[PDB]
Amino acid sequence: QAGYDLLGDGRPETLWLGIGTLLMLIGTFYFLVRGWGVTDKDAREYYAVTILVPGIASAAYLSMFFGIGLTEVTVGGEMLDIYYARYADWLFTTPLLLLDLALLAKVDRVTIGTLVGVDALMIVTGLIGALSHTAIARYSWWLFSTICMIVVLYFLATSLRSAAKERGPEVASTFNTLTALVLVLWTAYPILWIIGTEGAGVVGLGIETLLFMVLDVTAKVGFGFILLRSRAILGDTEAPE
Numbered sequence: 001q002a003g004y005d006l007l008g009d010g011r012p013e014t015l016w017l018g019i020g021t022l023l024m025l026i027g028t029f030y031f032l033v034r035g036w037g038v039t040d041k042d043a044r045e046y047y048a049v050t051i052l053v054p055g056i057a058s059a060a061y062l063s064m065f066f067g068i069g070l071t072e073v074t075v076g077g078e079m080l081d082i083y084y085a086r087y088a089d090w091l092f093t094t095p096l097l098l099l100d101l102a103l104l105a106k107v108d109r110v111t112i113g114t115l116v117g118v119d120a121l122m123i124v125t126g127l128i129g130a131l132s133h134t135a136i137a138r139y140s141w142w143l144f145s146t147i148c149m150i151v152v153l154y155f156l157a158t159s160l161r162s163a164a165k166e167r168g169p170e171v172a173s174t175f176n177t178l179t180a181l182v183l184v185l186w187t188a189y190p191i192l193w194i195i196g197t198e199g200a201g202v203v204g205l206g207i208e209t210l211l212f213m214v215l216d217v218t219a220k221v222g223f224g225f226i227l228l229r230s231r232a233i234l235g236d237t238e239a240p241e
């Protein structure tokens with residue numbers, strides 16, 4: 001794999017996992033310190049949700065860096081390297097990111113349940129695909145997961161967007177800016193997976209880990225930076241509970 005075997009354990013991708021760990025930690029601490037001076041009840045909710053996104057990713061990236069939760073999956077004569085913590089991270093952080101968007105939109109808890117449920121199914125079926133032992137199974141689960149993703153993104157771009165519009169220009173503009181990022185950045189994930197080690201195997205583990213790290217840092221720290229600097233986070237919220 002393209003990279004550098006930092007820990008001397010035969011894993012050049014740890015260069016990228018190490019860089020990712022550091023960036024997630026810096027982002028977490030930045031949001032934490034910024035949050036300490038926040039008093040508004042709504043803004044505190046966005047900070048709490050959003051700090052946890054690179055916070056949990058920090059733990060996942062540190063895990064992966066040290067090789068905790070790394071195993072191999074037999075696919076014919078190949079043994080594909082899978083990091084469980086990548087999927088565990090996404091299982092927690094994608095619902096949190098969607099909750100941020102749902103708070104902005106001020107949508108109801110059944111809408112939120114639908115959104116986060118389909119998102120969880122996306123991650124679970126991606127993991128099933130990653131652990132599957134035939135190409136046909138891996139591609140089939142990938143396709144199912146990708147349909148789940150399209151459903152999530154469609155809901156964001158239609159139902160939640162229309163709800164956010166009613167909340168006035170500040171909230172609408174922030175919702176729209178973040179949704180623009182999400183529709184593009186999230187779609188990059190299935191593309192990378194299917195061209196990478198899990199799918200067609202065009203891209204190797206090194207470049208793939210690098211690019212997932214960039215996507216993860218952008219979709220977490222980048223997203224969070226854009227959200228938390230907006231006046232929209234002062235607007236009234238209704239948590240699902």
Ligand SMILES: CCCCCCCCCCCCCCCC
Nearest residue numbers: 108110111114118121147148151
């Ligand atoms: C009042 C909000 C209603 C939200 C929509 C409820 C019906 C949606 C059913 C499930 C749709 C996702 C399919 C799961 C597989 C992609």
Ligand SMILES: CCCCCCCCCCCCCCCC
Nearest residue numbers: 134135136137138139140141144
């Ligand atoms: C054990 C297969 C479960 C089938 C249930 C339907 C799930 C949705 C379609 C995706 C199933 C992929 C199976 C791939 C087998 C080669």
Ligand SMILES: CCCCCCCCCCCCCCCC
Nearest residue numbers: 136139140141142143144145147
């Ligand atoms: C030959 C083994 C079965 C292949 C299953 C792959 C299909 C998985 C995706 C689900 C089917 C598409 C449904 C379209 C509705 C949006």
Ligand SMILES: CCCCCCCCCCCCCCCC
Nearest residue numbers: 150153154157158183184187188
């Ligand atoms: C209003 C449309 C909602 C559904 C959108 C789902 C798919 C997102 C399309 C964006 C594709 C980005 C490709 C980037 C390639 C690097």
Ligand SMILES: CCCCCCCCCCCCCCCC
Nearest residue numbers: 003004015019023213214217218
């Ligand atoms: C001998 C070791 C070579 C190390 C080369 C490192 C390349 C540059 C590091 C930055 C990687 C991309 C960072 C993306 C930030 C989201």
Ligand SMILES: CCCCCCCCCCCCCCCC
Nearest residue numbers: 023024026027030217218221222
């Ligand atoms: C204004 C002070 C900046 C401190 C921010 C710390 C976060 C650093 C992590 C890198 C995040 C890059 C996101 C990429 C956005 C496209």
Ligand SMILES: CCCCCCCCC
Nearest residue numbers: 004005006015018019022
């Ligand atoms: C021999 C150790 C190489 C360390 C590379 C550092 C990458 C800069 C972010």
Ligand SMILES: CCCCCCCCC
Nearest residue numbers: 028032051052055056059
């Ligand atoms: C203290 C803020 C970050 C919390 C992250 C939770 C996961 C770390 C194990």
Ligand SMILES: CCCCCCCCC
Nearest residue numbers: 058059060062063066068
């Ligand atoms: C919650 C942090 C997970 C990573 C711990 C590293 C353990 C040392 C090898």
Ligand SMILES: [Ca+2]
Nearest residue numbers: 040042234235
């Ligand atoms: Ca307020």
Ligand SMILES: [Cl-]
Nearest residue numbers: 038039040043
């Ligand atoms: Cl405040």
Ligand SMILES: [Cl-]
Nearest residue numbers: 039040041042
């Ligand atoms: Cl208040």
Ligand SMILES: [Cl-]
Nearest residue numbers: 002204206207
């Ligand atoms: Cl590679």
Ligand code: NA
Nearest residue numbers: 005006007014
């Ligand atoms: Na290493």
